[PDB]
Write a protein that binds this ligand. Structure first.
Ligand SMILES: [Mg+2]
Ligand SMILES: [Mg+2]
Ligand SMILES: [Mg+2]
Length: 802
RNA sequence: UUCACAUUGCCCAAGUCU
RNA sequence: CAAUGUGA
């Protein structure tokens, strides 16, 4: 299956709230615009170089062509004009000299009708013509692509009149995201602010000082320590410098000592260029070809402007970045608004050429604030908790189903001197108190409590515990902060022996709080098979009247700059009618592949376990799929919808449950703000939990909505977006929106509505745990990685990822 | 490794020419 | 999840 279903209706549930979105309405003319194909030889040039080439070409060849007209260009092969050029489908070949000569061919390809775009935005046309949207994108990006430094769909520039140094030769550049989007109303310009790290365009000498912590360079006047030379080398290698060259290495010898087949560097610069070095003690930059011999003294070189820093920031740099860029929701809103008035898109000569107007104020949108579900607890009292502003508490409440803990052990890997037996005893007493209150009685002292040190001690201790203590339910593992012992505990517990473990940092043992201990109990109960709470059964949407399984799926990709690590696919599935308990599946797969390769096998496993747990076969499968961008919807849907079907088909016998396939995107560039100040919640001033938007700024024909399910603590809340790619079950907007919100209240690790539904959230936890199982380990290769993430038989059916 | 929220890191995007 | 903040 392929085509996403149309929006069935609009939601009606919940009180209204006035909102503003960072979407700016566009007025687009109803005219044909003209699309030309460009070919530039040689063709290996950076996109920015191509834009320059075309810019000169446009100025140079005006009299024959382009005379009044201002073309826009995508930096590759696509040029657009507001009026036609004098051409046929007949190519015209031009020569361009750039202060290098280029051969450029211009060939007519098509007319883009903006009239058709209007119709498609309206009801009239069934589909949105991508190519037309792409053309508008090229118009809006034309000038900023050359005026600023493009990064993704954003643009960055050095800030005028201020500096935000990060140290280490790095600094903060502020910028904005920009994208053109169709909507139920008009075309929209989506604008958000952002910031990212760039290298300071400074003398290399200054760069050296920042990297090596020299106040000034004169200290010392010796050549560098190899370690100093190595550290500097790590930082500058790959960066571009100008006198433009990319640095490929730093010499071991100083410019004075360093020679090449042609004498010394220093002497060459004395002789040929009549320059004498201030600092001939320092090494040279080797630039250009690694196997060649071009060397530049540090003193003659500048880091060239506008190079983004790709490397991870240090902890101090990160701290500085956070402080420089953190903003409340109202402050974020004002910054976007100020940016829009300053950007003045309507005096952009290219936007102007195409007769486009952009509104300078945020679009007004009405939201609805859904009512939260009630949360049912257990014990005698069977207390009901009522969320308010996205939060509830467990005070005077007991777990729906609490586990009695009879046999448990403590392993303390923190040093006895810092985490004493008194600490452990007091922590134990306080934990037992909180746990009894929660209906998860820890009915005695641990059966075993020992200090250990180092990763080598984990496996023999755990094997001893498993072999010795019949009925052992839990090992509480105390850690001295960040340590490789954690990953070893999870390797052994989750994958080697299949034993429940709960780690706790030493600092939270030495000094306990009731809220931390309570939260800890949330995880312990779940890990041991308990049910913390359930949605009030009678408050659930009607989908629950028949057996239904809820799946959450995510792929997590390796960090920036990584070239060989696998991506990790995780799928979880509900295992009861509440829905509360989940089981997990996980796979390693191709580097940076978003499509879940082995999804059919994963879903089959989950369906089998669902039937084993409930003795029902689902009549419906609700699949929440995290993190797929719009440009991947069709490709992902095609493989993954078919994989779900395949799993069903292979199980049985005309078993064809209805599938609802929903993409959840937490990371996108849509922000919503309270119009009225009295609606702003808390210090951060965000929209309230439950705020739902399915009008105005959403898709013109398809079934999508924003739901900000969580209370915003800090900064500006990201309202999660939900796009229904497939729906056999024919949900109404209301039912699916309410279902989705209720699922955000079923996440076991906290008494709060979280920002995405529990199944999607668990899928993330599963993928992250697999990554932990793979630390320093990432056909024969694939099998090794696959073995590493496979949990023990006894762990298979548990919520070990909690 | 108590937990959520937020920033970055993740598919698409972006980027790579003496 | 890691780094860094804001909170419970
Ligand atoms: Mg993902
Ligand atoms: Mg790409
Ligand atoms: Mg953190």
């Amino acid at each position: 299956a392929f085509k996403p279903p149309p929006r069935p209706d609009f939601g009606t549930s919940g009180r209204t709230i006035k909102l503003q979105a960072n979407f700016f309405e566009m007025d687009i003319p109803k005219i044909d615009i003209y699309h030309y194909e460009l070919d530039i030889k040689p063709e290996k040039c950076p996109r920015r170089v191509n834009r320059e080439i075309v810019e000169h070409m446009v100025q140079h060849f005006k009299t024959q062509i382009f005379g009044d007209r201002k073309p826009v260009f995508d930096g590759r092969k696509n040029l657009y004009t507001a009026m036609p050029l004098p051409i046929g489908r007949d190519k015209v070949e031009l020569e361009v000299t750039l202060p290098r000569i280029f051969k450029v061919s211009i060939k007519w390809v098509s007319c883009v009708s903006l009239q058709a775009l209007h119709d498609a935005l309206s009801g009239r046309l069934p589909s949105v013509p991508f190519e037309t949207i792409q053309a508008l994108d090229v118009v809006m990006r034309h000038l900023p692509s050359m005026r600023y430094t493009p990064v993704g769909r954003s643009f960055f520039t050095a800030s005028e009149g201020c500096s935000n140094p990060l140290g280490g030769g790095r600094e903060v550049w502020f910028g904005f995201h920009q994208s053109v989007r169709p909507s139920l109303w008009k075309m929209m310009l989506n604008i958000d602010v952002s910031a990212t790290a760039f290298y300071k365009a400074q003398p290399v000498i200054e760069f050296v000082c920042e990297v090596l912590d020299f106040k000034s360079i004169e200290e010392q006047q010796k050549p560098l320590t190899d370690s100093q030379r190595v550290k500097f080398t790590k930082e500058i290698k790959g960066l571009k410098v100008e006198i433009k060259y990319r640095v490929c290495n730093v010499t071991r010898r100083p410019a004075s000592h360093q020679t090449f087949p042609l004498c010394t560097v220093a002497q060459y610069f004395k002789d040929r260029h009549k320059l004498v070095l201030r600092y001939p003690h320092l090494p040279c930059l080797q630039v250009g070809q690694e196997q060649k011999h071009t060397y530049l003294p540090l003193e003659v070189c500048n880091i060239v402007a506008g190079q983004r820093c790709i490397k991870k920031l240090t902890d101090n740099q990160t701290s500085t970045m956070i402080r420089a860029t953190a903003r409340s929701a109202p402050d974020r809103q004002e910054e976007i608004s100020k940016l829009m008035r300053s950007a003045d898109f309507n005096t952009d000569p290219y936007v102007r050429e195409f007769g486009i107007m952009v509104k300078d104020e945020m679009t007004d949108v009405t939201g609805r604030v859904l009512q939260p579900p009630s949360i049912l607890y257990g014990g005698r009292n069977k207390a009901i908790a009522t969320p308010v502003q996205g939060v509830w508490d467990m005070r005077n409440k007991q777990f729906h189903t609490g586990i009695e803990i009879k046999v448990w052990a403590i392993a303390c890997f923190a040093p006895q001197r810092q985490c004493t037996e008194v600490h452990l005893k007091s922590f134990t007493e306080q934990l037992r108190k909180i746990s009894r209150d929660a209906g998860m009685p820890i009915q005695g002292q641990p059966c075993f409590c020992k200090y250990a040190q180092g990763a080598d001690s984990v496996e023999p201790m755990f094997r001893h515990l498993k072999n010795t203590y019949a009925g052992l339910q839990l090992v509480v593992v105390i850690l001295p902060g960040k340590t490789p012992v954690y990953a070893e505990v999870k390797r052994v517990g989750d994958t080697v022996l299949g034993m429940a473990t709960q780690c706790v940092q030493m600092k939270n043992v030495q000094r306990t709080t009731p809220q931390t201990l309570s939260n800890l109990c949330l995880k312990i109960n779940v890990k041991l098979g308990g049910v913390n709470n359930i949605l009030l059964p009678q408050g659930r949407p009607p989908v629950f009247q028949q057996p239904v399984i809820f799946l959450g799926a995510d792929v997590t990709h390796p960090p920036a700059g990584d070239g060989k690590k696998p991506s990790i696919a995780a799928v979880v599935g509900s295992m009861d009618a509440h829905p509360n308990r989940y089981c997990a599946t996980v796979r390693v797969q191709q580097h940076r592949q978003e499509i879940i390769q082995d999804l059919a096998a994963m879903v089959r496993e989950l369906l089998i376990q669902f039937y084993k747990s409930t003795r029902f076969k689902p009549t419906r499968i609700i699949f929440y799929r995290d993190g797929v961008s719009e440009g991947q919807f069709q490709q992902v849907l095609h493989h993954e919808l078919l994989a779900i079907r395949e799993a069903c088909i292979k199980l049985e016998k005309d078993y064809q449950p209805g599938i609802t396939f929903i993409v959840v995107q937490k990371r996108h560039h849509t922000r919503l703000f309270c119009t009225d100040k009295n609606e702003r919640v808390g210090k951060s001033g965000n929209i309230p939990a439950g705020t739902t938007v399915d009008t105005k700024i959403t898709h013109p024909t398809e079934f999508d909505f924003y739901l900000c399910s969580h209370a915003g603590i800090q900064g500006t809340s990201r309202p999660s977006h939900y796009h229904v790619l497939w729906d056999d079950n024919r949900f109404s907007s209301d039912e699916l929106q309410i279902l989705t919100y209720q699922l955000c209240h079923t996440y076991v690790r906290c008494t709060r509505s979280v920002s995405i539904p529990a199944p999607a959230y668990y899928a993330h936890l599963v993928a992250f745990r697999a990554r932990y199982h793979l630390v320093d380990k990432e056909g024969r290769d694939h099998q090794a990685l696959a073995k590493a993430v496979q949990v023990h038989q006894d762990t298979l059916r548990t919520m070990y990822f909690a």
